[PDB]
Design a protein around this ligand. Structure first.
Ligand SMILES: Nc1ncnc2c1ncn2[C@@H]1O[C@H](COP(=O)(O)OP(=O)(O)OP(=O)(O)O)[C@@H](O)[C@H]1O
Ligand SMILES: [Mg+2]
Ligand SMILES: [Zn+2]
Lengths: 205, 221
C-alpha cells in the first residue's frame, strides 16, 4: 500500500529532477541506444527529498526494487512512440553512486549486517560469467500441469519446488526452454596493502 | 602536549646532535661514524618532483661491508627495534618474510592470497638485509627495480599490478675473500655489481686491525 506511494514518489523524483531534465533525458537516451541501465547519484535524491535518501541507507533491498519499478514506468512513459516490433518493455538496472568517504574493510562487524556499505580494496580473482534464472516454469510428471512465471529472488538464494500438486509427491520438474536468464559473476577482494596493520595478515571478501 | 614542549626544549640544547649520535646503539662499542650515518639515514630527507616529470627520492640507503666478528648484525637488530615500521630479512634463505611477491594459498588460513615482498610491506618504512652477497637472481632483480623505479610490477596468474615500494634500505655484507684488501677497490672486494652499489648513498668499510688497547676495552665490555 504505502510502498506504492513510495514508488510514486520515486517516479515523481525521476520525472521532475532538473535547468535541464538530467535523469529524464539520460533514461531516454539509454533506452534508445539499447543500454538498459542508469546511474543515480544519491546527493541528487537527498536534494530532491531527504526522506527516501535516508530510507535507502537502511533498507536497500525493498527500496531498490521500488526504484527499479519507478524507473521502468518512467522509461515507458517517456518512450511512447516506440518503433514497431519493440512493444515489449524491458527491465532496467539501477546503480548507486555517492561522494561519501569509504570505510575500512576491518570495520565490518555484526552491526553492519543488511546495511549499505562502501569499501576500498584490490581484486585478485574473477570467476567466469555465468547465467542465473529470474523467471522459471515447472511441469508435473503425471497430469502435465504447468506453473508459469515464478519469480526468483536476487542474490545467492535458491528456490524450493512445491511438493503438493493441485499424483505422486514431488512430481514437479523444471523446463529449461521457458526461462529467462541474466549474467552474474563472482569476485575476490583483498585488503589494500597501504592500510593493512603492521605485522598482521590481510583479510579478504 | 607536554611532549612537544619537551622536544622543543631539547632542540634548544647546543649539543643535541652529539647526544643523538651517541644515543644510537648503546650496547655497541665504537664505530661513531657508523652511528652517525645511521642517524642521518633514520632522520631522512625530503623527496622532490617538479611537475610530474622529474622524481628525486629522499631516502638514504646504507650499505656496510666488514670482516667477520665486527658486530654488523647488532646494528640491524637495534635499528629494527627502534624503527616503528622495520622489516628484517636475510639473503641466505629460509627467511620469515620473502623478498619476492607471489600468489599462493596460505598454509595456515588456507586462503588464496597475494603476498608481496618485504620491500612493499616496508612502504614508508625501513628494510634491513643481512647476508647481502648470498642472494639469488630474483632477489637481485627485485632489489634493483625497487631501488631504481621505487615500484614493483607483478604479472602472475592473470593479475597485473604495480605497487609502491618507498622504503629505506640498510644492508650488511662481507668481502669476497673473507678479509678486506686495501690494495683493491671497494667494487673489486664485493660480489655485488656496480649499478647496485651506485644506488647506496652511504658505504661503510669495517676492518679488523689488531689494536691492543681497543681489543682490551672490547674484551672488558
Ligand atoms: N664492538 C663490539 N661491542 C660488543 N660486542 C661486540 C663488538 N664487536 C663484536 N661483538 C660481539 O661479537 C659477536 C659476534 O656476533 P655478531 O652477530 O655480532 O657478528 P657479525 O659481525 O654479524 O658476524 P658475521 O660476519 O658472522 O655475520 C657478538 O656476540 C657481539 O656481541
Ligand atoms: Mg651476522
Ligand atoms: Zn500433477
Amino acid at each position: 500500500a504505502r510502498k506504492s506511494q513510495l514508488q510514486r514518489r520515486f517516479k515523481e523524483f525521476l520525472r521532475q529532477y532538473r535547468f535541464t531534465f538530467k535523469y529524464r533525458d539520460e533514461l531516454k537516451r539509454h533506452y534508445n541506444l539499447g543500454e538498459y541501465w542508469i546511474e543515480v547519484e544519491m546527493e541528487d535524491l537527498a536534494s530532491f527529498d531527504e526522506d527516501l535518501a535516508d530510507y535507502l541507507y537502511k533498507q536497500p533491498a525493498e527500496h531498490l526494487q521500488l526504484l527499479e519499478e519507478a524507473a521502468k514506468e518512467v522509461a515507458d512513459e517517456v518512450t511512447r512512440p516506440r518503433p514497431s516490433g519493440e512493444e515489449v518493455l524491458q527491465d532496467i538496472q539501477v546503480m548507486l553512486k555517492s561522494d561519501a568517504s569509504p570505510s575500512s574493510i576491518r570495520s565490518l562487524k555484526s552491526d553492519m549486517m543488511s546495511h549499505l556499505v562502501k569499501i576500498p580494496g584490490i581484486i585478485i580473482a574473477a570467476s567466469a560469467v555465468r547465467a542465473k534464472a529470474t523467471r522459471i516454469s515447472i511441469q508435473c510428471r503425471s497430469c502435465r500441469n504447468t506453473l508459469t512465471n515464478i519469480a526468483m529472488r536476487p542474490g545467492l538464494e535458491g528456490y524450493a519446488l512445491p511438493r503438493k500438486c493441485n499424483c505422486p509427491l514431488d512430481p514437479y520438474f523444471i523446463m529449461p526452454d521457458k526461462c529467462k536468464c541474466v549474467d552474474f559473476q563472482t569476485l575476490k577482494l583483498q585488503e589494500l596493502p597501504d592500510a593493512v596493520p603492521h605485522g598482521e595478515m590481510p583479510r579478504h571478501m | 602536549d607536554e611532549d612537544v614542549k619537551m622536544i622543543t626544549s631539547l632542540s634548544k640544547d647546543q649539543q643535541i646532535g652529539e647526544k643523538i649520535f651517541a644515543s644510537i646503539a648503546p650496547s655497541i662499542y665504537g664505530h661513531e661514524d657508523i652511528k652517525r650515518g645511521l642517524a642521518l639515514a633514520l632522520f631522512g630527507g625530503e623527496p622532490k618532483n617538479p611537475g610530474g616529470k622529474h622524481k628525486v627520492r629522499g631516502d638514504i640507503n646504507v650499505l656496510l661491508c666488514g670482516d667477520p666478528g665486527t658486530a654488523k648484525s647488532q646494528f640491524l637488530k637495534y635499528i629494527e627495534k627502534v624503527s616503528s615500521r622495520a622489516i628484517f630479512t636475510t639473503g641466505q634463505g629460509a627467511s620469515a618474510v620473502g623478498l619476492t611477491a607471489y600468489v599462493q594459498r596460505h598454509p595456515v588460513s588456507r586462503e588464496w592470497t597475494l603476498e608481496a615482498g618485504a620491500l612493499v610491506l616496508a612502504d614508508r618504512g625501513v628494510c634491513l638485509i643481512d647476508e647481502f652477497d648470498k642472494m639469488n637472481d630474483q632477489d637481485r632483480t627485485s632489489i634493483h627495480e625497487a631501488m631504481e623505479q621505487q615500484s614493483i610490477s607483478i604479472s602472475k596468474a592473470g593479475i597485473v599490478t604495480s605497487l609502491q615500494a618507498r622504503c629505506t634500505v640498510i644492508a650488511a655484507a662481507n668481502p669476497i675473500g673473507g678479509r678486506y684488501d686495501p690494495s683493491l677497490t671497494f667494487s673489486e672486494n664485493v660480489d655485488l655489481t656496480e649499478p647496485i652499489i651506485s644506488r647506496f648513498d652511504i658505504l661503510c668499510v669495517v676492518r679488523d686491525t689488531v689494536d691492543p688497547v681497543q681489543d682490551e676495552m672490547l674484551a672488558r665490555f
